[PDB]
Amino acid sequence: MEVVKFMDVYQRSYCHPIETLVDIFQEYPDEIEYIFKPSCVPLMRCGGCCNDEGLECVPTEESNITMQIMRIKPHQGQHIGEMSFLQHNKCECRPK
Amino acid sequence: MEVVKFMDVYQRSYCHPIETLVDIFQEYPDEIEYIFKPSCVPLMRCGGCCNDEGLECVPTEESNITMQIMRIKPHQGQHIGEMSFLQHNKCECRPK
């Protein structure tokens, strides 16, 4: 059986940017008159644990990534265009 | 600037197993008298989108992964022990 060693689990779970699949409407809530394809996008976002309830995992560097996304108005045409999304490039455990 | 091309976003977002950080208490709700270090673990879990509201992304192959976790409980001190977690090895879009 493969067992993940403690120090590896700890390092791999600690606060860091991790690819996270995010629904486009979480980021563009006012665009719900459209259907988007794909409907979700992979974004780097802070995730994981700090193992100290006085601390939270928060971004320390942010930027935007642009992706080609198809926009559909039901029963009308499709159009592919650029959409930008917030990413987290660096993460740290900071006091809450 | 980098722009992710449509077909690449579509492929990268589509229903598949993705590393997901999961709180251990969520997987072991019976053990809330424990403190775990780390408090979360990275698990392969189905994620992403199917781009069809008739379909949902669900596991088609499942197994357990075992990890060394520091377990802390009154009268046992802190000790490392094996804990197993459900993982999704294969994912498919299936009718809801």
Numbering used by the authors:
A (entry chain V), B (entry chain W): 12 to 107
Original paper wording:
In the present work, we focus on a class of monocyclic disulfide‐containing 19 amino acid peptides targeting the Vascular Endothelial Growth Factor‐A, the main pro‐angiogenic factor in Human. We proposed to use this peptide as a model to rationalize the thermodynamics of α‐helix stabilization by an i to i+4 lactam bridge. Around 950 Å2 of accessible surface area (ASA) was buried at the peptide‐VEGF interface, that overlapped with the VEGF receptor 1 domain 2 (VEGFR1‐d2)‐binding site. Although only lactam‐bridged ExxxK, DxxxK and KxxxD induced the formation of stable helix in the unbound state, all peptides of the series were helically folded when bound to VEGF.
VEGF‐peptide 2 c mixture crystallized also in a tetragonal form that contained no bound peptide. The main backbone displacements occurred in the 83–89 and 35–46 loops, that are flexible in molecular modelling studies as well. Moreover, the conformational exchange involving the flipping of the ϕ dihedral angle of VEGF Asn W62 was already noticed in several crystal structures of apo‐VEGF, which assumes that the two conformations are in dynamical equilibrium in solution.
